[PDB]
Every structure is written in C-alpha cells, then in structure tokens.
Amino acid sequence: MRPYEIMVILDPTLDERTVAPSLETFLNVIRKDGGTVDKVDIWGRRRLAYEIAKHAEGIYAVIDVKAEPATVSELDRQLNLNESVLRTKVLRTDKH
Amino acid sequence: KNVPHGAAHIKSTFNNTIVSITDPQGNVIAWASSGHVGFKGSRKSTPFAAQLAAENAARKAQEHGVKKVDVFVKGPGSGRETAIRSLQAAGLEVGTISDVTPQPHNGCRPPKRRR
Amino acid sequence: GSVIKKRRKRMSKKKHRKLLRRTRVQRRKLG
Amino acid sequence: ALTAEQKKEILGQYGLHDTDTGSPEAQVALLTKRIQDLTEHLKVHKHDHHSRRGLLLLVGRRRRLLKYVAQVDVARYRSLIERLGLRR
Amino acid sequence: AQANLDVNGRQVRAQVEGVNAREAVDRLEARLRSRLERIAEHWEARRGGVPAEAGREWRHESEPARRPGYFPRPPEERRIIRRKSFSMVPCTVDEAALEMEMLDYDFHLFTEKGTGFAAVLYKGGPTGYRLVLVIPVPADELSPFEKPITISTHPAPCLTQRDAVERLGLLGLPFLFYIDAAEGRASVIYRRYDGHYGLITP
Amino acid sequence: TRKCVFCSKKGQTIDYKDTALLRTYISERGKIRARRVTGNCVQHQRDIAVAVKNAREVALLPFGS
RNA sequence: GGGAGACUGGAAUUCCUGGUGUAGCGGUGGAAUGCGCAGAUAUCAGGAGGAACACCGGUGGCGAAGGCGGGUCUCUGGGCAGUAACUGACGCUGAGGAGCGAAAGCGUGGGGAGCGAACAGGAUUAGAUACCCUGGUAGUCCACGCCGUAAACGGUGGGUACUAGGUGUGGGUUUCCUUCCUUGGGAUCCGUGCCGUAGCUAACGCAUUAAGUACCCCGCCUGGGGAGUACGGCCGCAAGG
C-alpha cells in the first residue's frame, strides 16, 4: 500500500455541486479493494493555460489515496474512460 | 467593406517578404509581395523590396477602410525592420508588435547542411 | 601518425571490394 | 532487491546463529533468492540485458561462495546444496 | 623547353628540362596543364573560397560584423539604470531646439508651450527636425517657430514597460516615445551607452 | 553569486501544484530559466524543471506564451 | 538521461476539408527545372497521421563497453557514504569459451510526416556519372530474429601500494567561525576537469585519474610492399566476418 496523488481536470459544464459526490463513487472501488484511505480536495472552475478538448475552463480535483498499484491503475483506467473527465495525472507522494 | 481595425502579417524569409493585411477574424483583405512590386530573383530579398511591398500593402489596406493595425512579424530577419517602418510611414497606425515565429520543440529532421 | 598509411590501406581494401563485387556471381557459380 | 522482512526470514532460517549475516550459507541463500526473483522478472522482459548482466554477476558470486564452502567443509556444502535445491 | 600563353590577358609561362625533345615537350605540356588548372578563375574554381554561412568561418573578405553603438548587454540583466527628468517647464520649438543643441542629444523630451502636452523633438534627418506629441496637433495650435520642422502624424501609443522594451527591440528605432499604461504619462526609452535602457520620466 | 533559496532552512518544498513558486522561475516567454541566472543547486534545479514540466502537462503553465 | 514494459502531453513539418484572398510562389553566388492562375503562396478554423522531444542542458550525471534526457506508473541492475553487527583470505588475472556490442546491412509482418543512398531532370563546367537546385525509391520508425564490424580512441588491458602541491565541479558524512541564513571555513571518503614539482620520454608531452617508482596475470609486435590477400577451415539466408 503506497500513497498516490491524483489530479483530475473535469469539463466546466457540469455543476460543481455534483463533483464531490460523483467523484466519491469513483473512489468506492479503491475504497473496497484493500481498506484504503482517501482525502479529497476540490478547487475548480479555473481557466486552463491552453485549450483542452475544446474547453478553456476546468474543474480541478486533488485526491490523496493510499492503495495498491494495481488498484490505482484500475481507478485511473476508469477515470480516463469517463467522458466527464478532461484529464488525469497520477503522482507518487513517496520519495519518487 | 469597412474594417477600421485589423492585423498585419509579415513573413520575411531569406529570399522574399510577404505582407498581408487581415480582418482580425483572420481574413486577408489586401496583400502585397516582394515580387509583386516589380522585383524578381535575389533582388526581392533586399530590405528595399520589403519597403515597397509594405507600402503597397498599406495603401491597398488604407483605401479599404483600415486605420489602425497591429503587426505580427515572422521569419529570419531580412526586411522586418523596414517592413514595419514602411507600414508606419504610409499613414497606417501600428497598434502592437508581436514576434510569432514557428519554433519547433525539436521536431522533424532539418535538411542536410549545404557546402 | 600521417594519413598516408591509411590512404594506402583504404585504396587496397577498396580495390579488393571492387574485385569481389565484379566476381561475386562467378564465385557463387564456382563455389 | 529483496525487502527487509524477506532478508530477515532467510537469514533466520539459513543463518548459523541468530546474529550472522555474512556467513557463506546466508550469503548463498540470499543470492539464490535474488537470482530466482531476477529470473522471474527476466522471463517477462527478455530484452533487459543490463539486469541480465547483474544476474550473471550474482551467479558468479554464488558460485565462488559455494567453491569456498566446498573447499572448507564438504559436509556443509552437501547440506547447503541439498537444502537449496541446487545442482552444480 | 619554355612556353608562354596569353589567356585573355593573363600570362601563363612554364619551363622544363629533359634529355630529349619529346620528354621535354611532354613535361612542358603537363606543367602548362597544371598552371592552367590553377588559373581557371571561373565560378567552379572560385566557389569554395567565397565566404559562406553567416557567422561560422572567417575569411579576409568575409562581411564585417554589424556592431551597434551601444555595448551589447543582452536582455539577460539588461535593466534600466538611467532615469533623467531634466526639464518639464513649458518651452517653444526654438527654445526646445536650443536646449537640444547644447545638450548634444539627438532627441529631447519636453512639454510644449501652446499644447500643454508632452512632446519629443529629434533630428528629422535631411528633412530638418521632427516633432512628436502625445496627441497629434497641427502647426497652428503649436507655438510659433522659425526652425524648419515637421510633425509626426501618428500619436504616441499606450503600452506597458515590457511591451515597450519588446517594441523597441522589434522596431529597432533609437528610442520609443509612448504613454505608459500604468503611469498614464509620457515616457521615452532609449538604449543607453552601456546596454541598459534609459527611461526618461516626468 | 546568488542563493539556492531551497537549500536554506526556510526552503519551501517544490511541487507542481503551487503555480506561483514555478512562475517565479520561468522567463516571460515561459521558458525555464538557466541554473546560473537562478543560482539554485543542481538537485533543486532538476526538481524545478520536473515540476514545471508536470504543471505544463496538467495545463497550469502556458507552453511558451 | 542505468535498463525493460505500458499509458500519455505540447510546439512544429506534411497532407486533407472549409472560409478571406489575389498573381505570383519557391530557389540560388546568379538562375532554371518545379508549383499556380482549374485559384498557388499568404491568413484563419477544423481534421488525420508519423517521427523527434526546444527551454532545463554544461566539458554536468549514470553505465563494463556500445550508449543513455517530454511526462507518469510498474518491474529491475549497479554505485557511494556512515555504523562497523557479521564470515574469516573466501582475493587478482584469465588461454580457450560464453554474453553484451554504434551505424550501415539481411529475413518475416506492420508503418511511412520530415530527411534521404539509388534514380530523374535544372544549373556550373572543356568535360560533370559530384559539389548547388527541384522531385524522389530503399532506409531511417515498431515487433521478433540475424550480422558482429567503427578513428568500437584517452589511439593508454586488469588489480594493488607509494611519490610536492594549487584551484574548479558532482555525491555523502562530520569539527570550529557562527549569523548558524552563508560555495563561511576546516577535516575525510568516493568521482570528474585545469595548471604544475620530482620523475619518465627521441620529442611532443604524461605528471596522485602516470606515459613515475614496483609486484601478479592476460593480449599483442619483430623492416616496407605483396596482404589482413590467396588456399584450406569455422560461422553467416546474404553481404561478408
């Protein structure tokens, strides 16, 4: 179980009041995999430096997870598959 | 048509200069080239040819209702200096100067060196 | 050292390679 | 390489006493475990030649340690070989 | 054996020794062939000696590097370390020209008498002198003068400090006169004699 | 010379989220500033470059504005 | 930037589509082939695809060597420092042998934007099977395999001990100026440069990273051509080694 930091940018059209619950469900799998701990922070509706997928503004979410690499990869695959997620980026908050 | 405010695109290569006045939505309304003002061959790489082309384009934009323009220079320096000076000198007010040269992030292989 | 020796060696190797190119098919038919 | 717990368990099982870590038996056991892990890795990445060189170095070191053991005490060499499932 | 040829005004001569006429003639022919080869002077033989590239390699006839009057001091740590505010008492064109002349400065920023606006005079070259104002006005509103001058029809534009430096770099003028965006007043930037920019402010 | 503001006892950690700490390290054209003109140590220069590239990848800094 | 795998980001080139838009564009020392007038170049918007990763970026890091930098994740090798707990000479070298081994090249299957052997024209020339220009196939790319060569060079085999120093720079430990911010300075271990003693050399030069002083092991040389060629043999699909 290693710590990870996932930064996601979502399209601005969807309401912000649904970002926190919906993202919650996206973590449910990694919650039920191996007893993992999550910390979710949301600072969204910020204009991007460059246009991403015909969009200028985006919602930024930061998720601090402590989980197995396979679980994090599976979660990243699901997040990329979703059509309401413009981009994702996974970092390791360890020495790496 | 009447476009009071537009943009100026100057492409100064090593052997030619092309000046085009553009309705800011990106539509060329009047263009003059180095070879269009009576030059041909190496003669059209000179700064004087750039001066003549810039003045001709400035007039061909002025009678179309263009008053104030902003310049986007581009290309290795051959007659950019004289191009902007001539654009100003023909009664066309210059708003801003921007250097937008296509700069690759090390992409594509350049042609082999000459000798 | 001087490149004269290298010039002699490259000339010899080049001539041998040209000879091999000229007689490739004959060597194959006799080999 | 191996984690601390695997090293501790290998040393406890193969070490002569509860403290030694550089005894040839313990070194041979650790090298064999590392070799098997590296082999399992290389079965997937066939073109990882640098780790293959590292594996060669480990194999040579294990062979030298076994040579030293067989030169000092034959019975210990036989016991170690039979316990770790080695051939030569 | 001696041979002399007049190839289009160029004299090519050769001389050889030999044991008989045939050997001497053959050696003379070889020598003359070598001389004519070295004489060619046509483009194919004078193309490898012509200076090439822009900065790489140096030759006797290579184009000398164009050097500006100021010390280079590249954009890295260029800075603005000269800020004069000599005079903003109102003056006329002739008085401004005299204030120019003894200061030995090509351009000069003052405030005009009639307009009450900031203006910059400079040498207009063979045309005389040229006057640039923050807002262009005709000669009648301008205070009376006797020097032969002309007025620049364009107005001094509004732009920032970095934008002003960029415009000066991409426009190559000895100075730029403009209304500062933040300050809202006149400003004249010139490349100094040490490589920094000289910003003259009120 | 100049000081590696990170080797100090008050050196803030280098992250790709805090955009101002990276904007202070890139030129006005968006390019990464050299090490000599900055003065930071090699490890901190490399960390700064990595953070800048990551922030560019997550659309926090322009790609040469 | 040690290696392998997977996913993925942006600038730019090319092409396609749709607007604005005209008579040139392109190229050179100078031009002409060439492209365009059937709407080119230029400018904007959209789309497709391939390759390489500007800034960081250097005589700086890693690797036995070849060599290795867009980002993230997974797997994995090596090195250095300190403590010195542990084994107790287990070390060095290594004929043959095995493995890795730039680029080019070969085989099967893909991919093909740019560059580009061969090949066409244009130009220069007395002649141009070339240098320069316009096009351009293999190839460069990916997967699995072959070959086994390079100025594969530091033209300097591996290990060890000793022999004045001075100054850059990378990594790690610690004492004293002490603000303890500061390349403060000192000490020490491991790299990587420059200058210089003794010493060595035919000289140039090397000089604690020896080409100095010595010990252990291996490879190689015995005038230049003929020739790294012929014959024979081994390997290779072939080139060839």
Author numbering:
A (entry chain g): 1 to 96
B (entry chain l): 23 to 137
C (entry chain v): 2 to 32
D (entry chain p): 2 to 89
E (entry chain w): 54 to 255
F (entry chain s): 17 to 81
From the paper:
Ribosome hibernation is a key survival strategy bacteria adopt under environmental stress, where a protein, hibernation promotion factor (HPF), transitorily inactivates the ribosome. Mycobacterium tuberculosis encounters hypoxia (low oxygen) as a major stress in the host macrophages, and upregulates the expression of RafH protein, which is crucial for its survival. The RafH, a dual domain HPF, an orthologue of bacterial long HPF (HPFlong), hibernates ribosome in 70S monosome form, whereas in other bacteria, the HPFlong induces 70S ribosome dimerization and hibernates its ribosome in 100S disome form. The RafH binding would block all known critical sites of translation initiation: the decoding center, the a-SD sequence of 16S rRNA, and the bS1 protein at the platform binding center of the ribosomal small subunit.
A similar approach of multi-body refinement was applied to improve the quality of cryo- EM maps for classes 2 and 4 separately. Some of the flexible regions, such as RafH CTD, E-site tRNA, L1 stalk, L7/L12 stalk, bS1, uS2, and H54a, having a lower resolution, were interpreted by applying a low pass filter of 3.5 Å resolution to the final maps. For bS1 r-protein, the two N- terminus domains, OB1 and OB2, were clearly visible, whereas other parts were disordered. The uS11 and OB2 domain of the bS1 sandwich the RafH CTD. The RafH CTD, which binds to unique binding site at PBC of the 30S subunit, also engages the bS1 r-protein. Therefore, the bS1 protein would not be available to facilitate the translation initiation in RafH bound form. Besides this, OB1 of bS1 also interacts with the uS2 r-protein. The RafH CTD, which is longer than HPFlong CTD, binds at the PBC and is sandwiched between bS1 and uS11 r-proteins. Interestingly, we found that bS1 r-protein was present in a small fraction (23%) of the total particles, suggesting its involvement in RafH mediated ribosome hibernation and further stabilizing the RafH CTD binding. As the 3′ end of 16S rRNA is blocked by the RafH CTD and bS1 r-protein, it further suggests that in hibernating ribosomes, the 3′ end would not be accessible to 3′ to 5′ exonucleases, RNase PH/RNase R.
